[PDB]
Short mmCIF file of C-alpha atoms and ligand atoms in Angstrom, two decimals:
data_model
loop_
_atom_site.label_atom_id
_atom_site.label_comp_id
_atom_site.label_asym_id
_atom_site.label_seq_id
_atom_site.Cartn_x
_atom_site.Cartn_y
_atom_site.Cartn_z
CA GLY A 1 23.19 13.49 9.15
CA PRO A 2 24.00 10.56 7.53
CA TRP A 3 21.72 9.97 4.51
CA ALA A 4 22.79 10.83 0.47
CA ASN A 5 21.32 13.91 -0.67
CA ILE A 6 18.04 12.71 -2.28
CA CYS A 7 17.25 14.67 -5.19
CA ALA A 8 19.12 15.64 -8.01
CA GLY A 9 19.29 19.54 -8.11
CA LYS A 10 20.78 19.87 -4.61
CA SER A 11 23.84 20.41 -2.39
CA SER A 12 21.66 18.92 0.48
CA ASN A 13 18.59 17.80 1.87
CA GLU A 14 16.89 21.01 2.06
CA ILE A 15 13.41 20.85 4.34
CA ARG A 16 10.39 22.95 2.89
CA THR A 17 9.07 25.59 4.74
CA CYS A 18 5.60 27.55 4.49
CA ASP A 19 3.82 27.82 1.08
CA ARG A 20 0.26 28.02 0.38
CA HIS A 21 -0.81 24.91 1.32
CA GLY A 22 0.93 24.54 4.45
CA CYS A 23 4.68 23.57 6.04
CA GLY A 24 7.19 20.79 5.64
CA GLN A 25 8.29 20.11 8.76
CA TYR A 26 8.08 17.44 11.09
CA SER A 27 5.02 17.64 13.20
CA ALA A 28 3.97 20.42 10.75
CA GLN A 29 0.06 21.40 11.20
CA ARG A 30 -2.47 19.41 9.09
CA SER A 31 -5.87 19.06 8.80
CA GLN A 32 -6.49 15.79 10.65
CA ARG A 33 -3.80 15.17 12.14
CA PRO A 34 -0.03 16.67 12.45
CA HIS A 35 2.77 15.75 8.93
CA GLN A 36 3.86 12.46 9.69
CA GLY A 37 7.24 12.94 7.88
CA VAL A 38 9.31 15.26 6.43
CA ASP A 39 8.92 17.32 2.71
CA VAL A 40 12.51 17.11 1.05
CA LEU A 41 12.94 20.25 -1.29
CA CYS A 42 13.00 18.58 -5.18
CA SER A 43 11.96 19.94 -8.70
CA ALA A 44 9.00 18.21 -10.12
CA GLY A 45 10.76 15.55 -12.73
CA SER A 46 14.12 15.78 -10.98
CA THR A 47 15.91 12.16 -10.72
CA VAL A 48 15.88 10.79 -6.80
CA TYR A 49 18.83 9.04 -5.35
CA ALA A 50 18.95 6.37 -2.47
CA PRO A 51 19.16 8.21 0.92
CA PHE A 52 20.95 5.12 1.85
CA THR A 53 21.59 1.57 1.29
CA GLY A 54 19.46 -1.47 1.53
CA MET A 55 16.10 -3.33 0.11
CA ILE A 56 13.17 -1.86 -1.60
CA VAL A 57 10.68 -3.64 0.31
CA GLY A 58 7.65 -2.80 -1.81
CA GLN A 59 5.40 0.09 -3.66
CA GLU A 60 3.84 2.56 -0.53
CA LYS A 61 1.07 4.75 -2.02
CA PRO A 62 0.44 7.88 -0.84
CA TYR A 63 -3.00 8.08 -1.32
CA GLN A 64 -6.42 6.00 -1.25
CA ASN A 65 -7.35 7.48 -4.81
CA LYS A 66 -5.40 7.51 -8.24
CA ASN A 67 -3.70 11.58 -8.34
CA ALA A 68 -0.36 12.25 -10.76
CA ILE A 69 2.01 11.98 -7.74
CA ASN A 70 -0.07 8.94 -6.04
CA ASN A 71 3.71 6.49 -6.40
CA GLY A 72 6.10 5.24 -3.91
CA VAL A 73 8.17 3.10 -1.93
CA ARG A 74 9.39 1.60 1.14
CA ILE A 75 12.77 1.07 1.86
CA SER A 76 14.87 -0.51 4.77
CA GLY A 77 18.42 -1.31 5.43
CA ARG A 78 21.54 -0.27 7.37
CA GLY A 79 19.37 0.76 10.39
CA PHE A 80 16.95 2.60 8.71
CA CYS A 81 13.18 2.19 7.41
CA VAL A 82 11.64 5.00 5.33
CA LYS A 83 8.56 5.71 3.00
CA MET A 84 9.33 8.11 0.11
CA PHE A 85 6.41 9.30 -1.49
CA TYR A 86 5.51 11.19 -5.19
CA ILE A 87 8.29 9.07 -7.18
CA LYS A 88 8.00 6.32 -10.01
CA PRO A 89 10.51 4.39 -8.80
CA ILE A 90 13.10 2.33 -11.02
CA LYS A 91 11.37 -0.77 -9.35
CA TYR A 92 9.18 -1.88 -6.38
CA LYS A 93 11.59 -4.71 -4.88
CA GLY A 94 15.24 -5.38 -4.40
CA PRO A 95 18.64 -3.72 -3.54
CA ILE A 96 19.39 -0.50 -3.72
CA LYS A 97 22.70 1.60 -3.24
CA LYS A 98 22.98 4.59 -1.24
CA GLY A 99 23.00 7.97 -3.93
CA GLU A 100 21.45 5.16 -6.36
CA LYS A 101 19.12 6.38 -9.13
CA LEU A 102 15.47 5.67 -7.61
CA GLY A 103 13.21 7.40 -9.48
CA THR A 104 11.62 10.40 -10.81
CA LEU A 105 9.58 13.07 -9.04
CA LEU A 106 5.96 13.17 -9.91
CA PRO A 107 4.07 16.41 -11.27
CA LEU A 108 3.47 18.37 -7.33
CA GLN A 109 2.55 21.25 -9.42
CA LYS A 110 -0.10 19.35 -11.16
CA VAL A 111 -1.38 18.07 -7.72
CA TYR A 112 -0.36 20.98 -5.28
CA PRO A 113 0.14 24.46 -8.00
CA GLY A 114 2.47 26.79 -5.91
CA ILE A 115 3.38 24.00 -3.26
CA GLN A 116 7.49 23.72 -2.73
CA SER A 117 8.17 20.88 -4.76
CA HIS A 118 8.98 17.81 -2.66
CA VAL A 119 9.47 14.36 -1.97
CA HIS A 120 7.79 13.47 1.37
CA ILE A 121 9.75 11.06 3.60
CA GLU A 122 8.85 9.05 6.68
CA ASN A 123 10.34 6.74 9.05
CA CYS A 124 8.38 3.39 8.53
CA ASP A 125 7.41 4.13 12.59
CA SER A 126 6.36 7.74 11.72
CA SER A 127 8.96 9.26 14.13
CA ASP A 128 11.22 12.11 13.60
CA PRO A 129 13.66 11.45 10.52
CA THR A 130 14.92 15.25 10.25
CA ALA A 131 17.91 14.35 11.90
CA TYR A 132 18.99 11.55 9.20
CA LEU A 133 18.94 14.10 6.65
CA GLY B 1 2.94 46.65 -15.68
CA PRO B 2 -0.24 45.70 -17.77
CA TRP B 3 0.77 41.68 -18.29
CA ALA B 4 -0.75 39.09 -16.29
CA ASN B 5 0.51 36.88 -13.96
CA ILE B 6 2.72 34.18 -15.60
CA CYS B 7 3.14 31.33 -13.03
CA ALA B 8 0.48 29.29 -11.82
CA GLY B 9 0.48 29.20 -8.24
CA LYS B 10 2.23 32.23 -8.00
CA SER B 11 0.93 35.74 -6.38
CA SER B 12 3.13 37.98 -9.02
CA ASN B 13 5.86 38.27 -11.83
CA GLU B 14 8.89 37.82 -9.05
CA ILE B 15 12.14 38.37 -10.84
CA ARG B 16 15.20 35.62 -10.15
CA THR B 17 17.69 37.02 -7.87
CA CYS B 18 21.44 35.63 -8.09
CA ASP B 19 22.15 32.12 -7.76
CA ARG B 20 24.94 29.76 -8.55
CA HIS B 21 24.61 30.19 -12.49
CA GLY B 22 23.89 33.83 -12.73
CA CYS B 23 21.59 36.64 -11.92
CA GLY B 24 17.49 37.12 -13.21
CA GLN B 25 17.52 40.80 -13.83
CA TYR B 26 17.87 42.25 -17.47
CA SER B 27 21.34 43.12 -18.23
CA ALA B 28 22.73 40.83 -15.50
CA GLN B 29 26.24 39.14 -16.65
CA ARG B 30 26.28 36.30 -18.78
CA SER B 31 29.51 35.49 -20.90
CA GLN B 32 29.73 37.19 -24.63
CA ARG B 33 26.38 39.77 -23.91
CA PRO B 34 24.30 40.55 -21.71
CA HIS B 35 21.19 38.69 -19.89
CA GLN B 36 18.96 40.08 -23.21
CA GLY B 37 15.29 39.54 -21.07
CA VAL B 38 14.03 38.69 -17.21
CA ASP B 39 14.03 35.54 -15.72
CA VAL B 40 10.45 35.05 -14.26
CA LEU B 41 10.76 32.67 -10.72
CA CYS B 42 8.33 29.96 -11.40
CA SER B 43 8.22 26.20 -10.12
CA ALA B 44 9.11 22.83 -12.79
CA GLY B 45 6.13 21.66 -14.26
CA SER B 46 3.38 24.89 -13.42
CA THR B 47 1.46 25.87 -15.53
CA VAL B 48 2.55 29.33 -17.37
CA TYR B 49 -0.11 31.96 -18.92
CA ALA B 50 0.20 34.16 -21.58
CA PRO B 51 1.32 37.76 -20.21
CA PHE B 52 -0.68 39.18 -22.82
CA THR B 53 -3.54 39.19 -25.78
CA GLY B 54 -2.24 37.98 -29.10
CA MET B 55 -0.99 35.46 -31.31
CA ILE B 56 1.48 32.02 -30.61
CA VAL B 57 4.28 32.89 -33.78
CA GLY B 58 6.24 29.79 -33.95
CA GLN B 59 8.17 27.53 -32.19
CA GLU B 60 11.37 29.33 -30.82
CA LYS B 61 14.08 27.24 -28.99
CA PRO B 62 16.88 28.86 -26.67
CA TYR B 63 19.21 26.27 -27.48
CA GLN B 64 21.16 24.71 -30.41
CA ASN B 65 21.61 21.42 -29.11
CA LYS B 66 18.28 19.54 -27.77
CA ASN B 67 18.23 18.95 -23.66
CA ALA B 68 15.32 18.61 -21.31
CA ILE B 69 14.05 22.83 -21.56
CA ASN B 70 14.91 23.27 -25.50
CA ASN B 71 11.52 24.42 -25.73
CA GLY B 72 9.48 27.87 -25.76
CA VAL B 73 7.35 30.24 -28.40
CA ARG B 74 7.33 34.18 -29.59
CA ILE B 75 3.87 35.95 -29.18
CA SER B 76 3.07 38.99 -30.94
CA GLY B 77 -0.05 41.23 -30.36
CA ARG B 78 -1.68 44.89 -28.53
CA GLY B 79 1.94 46.33 -29.17
CA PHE B 80 4.13 43.74 -27.55
CA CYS B 81 6.32 40.92 -28.75
CA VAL B 82 7.64 38.33 -26.91
CA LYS B 83 9.98 35.12 -26.90
CA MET B 84 9.12 32.90 -23.93
CA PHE B 85 11.82 30.20 -23.24
CA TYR B 86 11.65 26.70 -21.15
CA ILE B 87 8.05 25.82 -22.10
CA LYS B 88 6.30 23.07 -23.73
CA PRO B 89 3.59 25.39 -25.46
CA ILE B 90 -0.29 24.01 -25.94
CA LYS B 91 0.40 25.16 -29.99
CA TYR B 92 3.19 26.52 -31.76
CA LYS B 93 0.39 28.96 -33.50
CA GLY B 94 -2.62 30.75 -32.61
CA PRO B 95 -4.57 33.02 -30.79
CA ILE B 96 -4.38 33.21 -27.15
CA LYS B 97 -5.82 35.50 -24.52
CA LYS B 98 -4.23 37.31 -21.53
CA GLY B 99 -3.98 34.96 -18.37
CA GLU B 100 -4.85 31.79 -21.31
CA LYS B 101 -2.84 28.66 -20.40
CA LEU B 102 0.22 28.82 -22.45
CA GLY B 103 1.83 25.77 -21.35
CA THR B 104 4.04 24.13 -18.85
CA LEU B 105 7.35 24.88 -17.56
CA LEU B 106 9.98 22.41 -18.08
CA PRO B 107 12.56 20.75 -15.95
CA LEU B 108 15.33 23.37 -15.47
CA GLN B 109 17.16 21.17 -12.87
CA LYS B 110 18.19 19.22 -15.32
CA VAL B 111 20.02 21.15 -17.25
CA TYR B 112 21.45 23.36 -14.84
CA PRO B 113 21.40 22.05 -11.02
CA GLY B 114 20.93 24.65 -8.31
CA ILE B 115 19.42 27.51 -10.76
CA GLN B 116 16.19 29.00 -9.14
CA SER B 117 12.93 27.60 -11.92
CA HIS B 118 12.18 30.24 -14.12
CA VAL B 119 10.83 31.31 -17.41
CA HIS B 120 13.16 33.48 -19.40
CA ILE B 121 10.99 36.76 -21.08
CA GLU B 122 12.51 38.66 -23.56
CA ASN B 123 10.86 41.47 -26.14
CA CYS B 124 11.67 40.48 -29.44
CA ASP B 125 14.09 43.83 -29.99
CA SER B 126 15.60 43.24 -26.76
CA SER B 127 14.31 46.13 -24.97
CA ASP B 128 14.03 45.40 -21.01
CA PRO B 129 10.52 44.07 -20.48
CA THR B 130 10.72 44.63 -16.66
CA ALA B 131 8.37 47.86 -16.11
CA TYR B 132 5.81 45.41 -18.04
CA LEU B 133 5.69 42.37 -15.31
ZN1 LIG C 1 4.77 15.54 3.43
ZN1 LIG C 2 17.22 34.84 -18.55
#
């Protein structure tokens, strides 16, 4: 698909399969409700890059409570609007270019030891983003 | 083998198979001399545990020039003696028990993008450690 490879160490945007914590695909089984995004493979500590050109809209945290991975952002532009979780970003507002450094992946293995480390990416309307990867 | 599972969140010690950069088995191809140890699969940022009971007997860096993974230790005791690379250890010297936290795996993807993240473990005499894993 159209998006840039998001994770510094990767040829493409590969998706988390199934590990001891769960599975990474859109609508994957979760406890209250299905998985609302897609988990894109990425090594803890890695540089993450913008999937598309647009504007960082704001900080957007994945969780209501503090943990080692509780940061992220919303980005919109070029027909796309995503929330990207488990990243410490460079900035919480302003312009960003496709493939530009967006931030660093936070300590996935500290929070979920044995997970396939990933960025969780979600369309802003919670629709399936898989086609764009 | 008698050694503890090294990588938090894994079930057992599993050896890196071949990727872009090379292969993880003992005596696998490397540039001027064969692979002197075994590469145990482990995710960047995972806790790493001591494979056996002994003494941490100093820092052992893998490389002459600094990079994100350039740390490790030597451990000896109970008739074993190993070097373990790519870990930030809890300490450089002192007692450790089999299965106790030794440290945390450094971010291999910053140095060798596309490698399977792993701990490199080597017997101090460079004999094959595979049977102990
Ligand atoms: Zn997810
Ligand atoms: Zn090795």
